[PDB]
Amino acid sequence: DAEFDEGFKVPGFLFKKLFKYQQTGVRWLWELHCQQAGGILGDEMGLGKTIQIIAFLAGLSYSKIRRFEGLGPTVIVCPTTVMHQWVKEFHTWWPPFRVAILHETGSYTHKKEKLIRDVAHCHGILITSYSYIRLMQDDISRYDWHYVILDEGHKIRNPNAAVTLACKQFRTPHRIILSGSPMQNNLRELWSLFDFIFPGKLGTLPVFMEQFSVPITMGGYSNASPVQVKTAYKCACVLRDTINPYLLRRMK
């Protein structure tokens, strides 16, 4: 079995299945787990980011690292269209995770609050939709979640939407985002995503805008004075190295 520096025994019969970039991503995720910080798996689509997440969480459960004897209760907030896919992925990679879906389709056939209580009581792997986070935002956030994975976390791109507030109402240090593009329109979305994964790293959104967004866009025009473009370049460099150790993005 592959072993990391402090001791994180990712099983050999899973770790061997990953690709080189996937193993690098698991390494990066576990570095975050040691620093007790969150990140963005900003790898574009098709590389496979769910495989990295299940591999890392499975290694964290088998390695029994500890708070919690191994991995505790984790919540995965993904669009409905992929929820069942997620459970199948777990069930084919690491069976012994008691994975459960929170949905009207579901499988619980009883009160959903009882499902949250039971799953947390077994340190299970619970999958929701963003709407359920928004609606039960007071209820679902009472059972000491150990991980929060916002798959397709660009649903958080708006720092105003009720889904953003409900998702930022979680308390764990561990916040991972699986988005093919952290930003889509402008830097509001980058700020919102970083406010999710790491509450304090980037400043308050006013500060962030006034330091980064306005200078960069002002230096994005070809009629800008030379001072403007040079300041835009410098500020872009500062934002890049500030976000370097927490956004793992790989291209094709």
């Binding site: 620093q35 007790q36 910080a37 969150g38 308390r171 764990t172 240090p173 916040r175 994964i197 790491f198 509450p199 304090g200 790293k201 980037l202 400043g203 308050t204 500060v207 962030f208 330091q211 460099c237 500062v238 190295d241 500030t242």
Partner: protein
């Protein structure tokens, strides 16, 4: 002393014995040396002094007049009497001189070529000692009470900055990122101090009567909040868990970093277990401070028993850290003492004060 010399010479006692015992004796014999002077260059009160950590030869000094002075503390003259000459100075004519009071100044640890200084002009300037020019400036939205670089981190080179804002700014001197903020305090952060033991432990003290230990890697708030009582008065943490009954205006880790000394405007100094933030219940008596800004105080290093030199009004009160017994009061200043700094190489003390003087305390005999 002859018994000590013989025991060192014959191997009965470890030489560590003679070092620590004689250093302790020198600290207890610490007294105002009129046989040594520091050249008076500040037109205003000295708020901060910092002797370089490597070689302990040069000292920085920041005054309320906004100037910085860089002194040589070695007796380069052959006489037994000398004046600590001012090597360099960021004076009123330096283009980068601070517009307001220099409240803190710190040598770059690991090398003497760089030092950083913060002011009430809402700037933390990084100075290249050799050229005596600013290499970087960190502007903040509100006036800085204290800054500190980790004396121990070979990995990160963050400056923890406490301003009047409720947030603690972390500025990376390695490529410049002053965006990180540690939130959880409610009033001005009057003191910040990195642990000398752990690269990433930062203790921050604020006017909201709380001291918090942070793990700047962590993304989930303060590790520990210091509590006077340790649980005797326990409340859902919204207003309780105060380190002091007033503003906490001074922080200092002990030499080994296993304890933290906090001084607050409740006229108390408390000693805390730096790992679980438990009050050690060391008494220290009454430690008079009414400072409205950060109070810079130091501890001894490399002695048999550790000491803390705390500004006590116009005097410097010397206490034993782990018993509270006040060793003495060094009385030579004419106004309130703002900062004292310890030369561990020779058990010497330098104290600045609002009387625009820096007094050297040397061991007698």
């Amino acid at each position: 002393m002859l018994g000590f010399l013989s025991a060192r010479q014959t191997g009965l006692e470890d030489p560590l014995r003679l070092r620590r015992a004689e250093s302790t004796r020198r600290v207890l014999g610490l007294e105002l040396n009129k046989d040594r002077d520091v050249e008076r260059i500040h037109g205003g009160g000295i708020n901060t002094l910092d002797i370089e950590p490597v070689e302990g030869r040069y000292m920085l000094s920041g005054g309320s007049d906004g100037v910085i002075v860089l002194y040589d503390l070695e007796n380069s003259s052959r006489q037994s009497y000398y004046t600590c000459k001012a090597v360099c100075s960021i004076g009123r004519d330096h283009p980068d001189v601070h517009r307001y009071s220099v409240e803190t100044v710190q040598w770059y640890p690991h090398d003497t070529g760089m030092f950083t200084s913060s002011s009430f002009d809402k700037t933390l300037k990084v100075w290249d000692t050799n050229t005596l020019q600013t290499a970087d400036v960190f502007n903040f939205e509100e006036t800085v009470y204290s800054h500190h670089m980790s004396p121990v981190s070979t990995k990160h080179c963050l400056v923890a900055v406490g301003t009047r804002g409720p947030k603690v700014q972390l500025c990376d001197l390695k490529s410049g990122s002053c965006s990180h903020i540690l939130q959880g305090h409610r009033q001005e952060i009057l003191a910040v101090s990195w642990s000398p033991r752990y690269d990433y432990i930062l203790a921050t003290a604020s006017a909201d009567s709380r001291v918090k230990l942070w793990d700047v890697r962590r993304a989930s708030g303060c590790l520990i909040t210091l509590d006077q009582h340790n649980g005797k008065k326990s409340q859902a943490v919204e207003s309780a868990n105060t380190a002091h009954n007033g503003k906490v205006n001074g922080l200092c880790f002990t030499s080994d970093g296993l304890h933290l000394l906090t001084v607050g405007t409740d006229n108390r100094m408390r000693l805390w277990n730096s790992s679980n933030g438990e009050n050690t219940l060391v008494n220290y008596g009454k430690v008079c401070n009414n400072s409205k800004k950060g109070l810079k105080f130091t501890v001894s290093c490399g002695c048999s028993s550790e000491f803390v030199f705390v500004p006590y009004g116009s005097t410097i009160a010397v206490y034993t850290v782990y018993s509270g017994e006040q060793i003495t009061m060094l009385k030579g200043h004419y106004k309130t003492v703002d900062c004292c700094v310890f030369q561990s190489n020779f058990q010497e003390l330098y104290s600045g004060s609002r009387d625009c003087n820096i007094l050297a305390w040397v061991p007698s005999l």
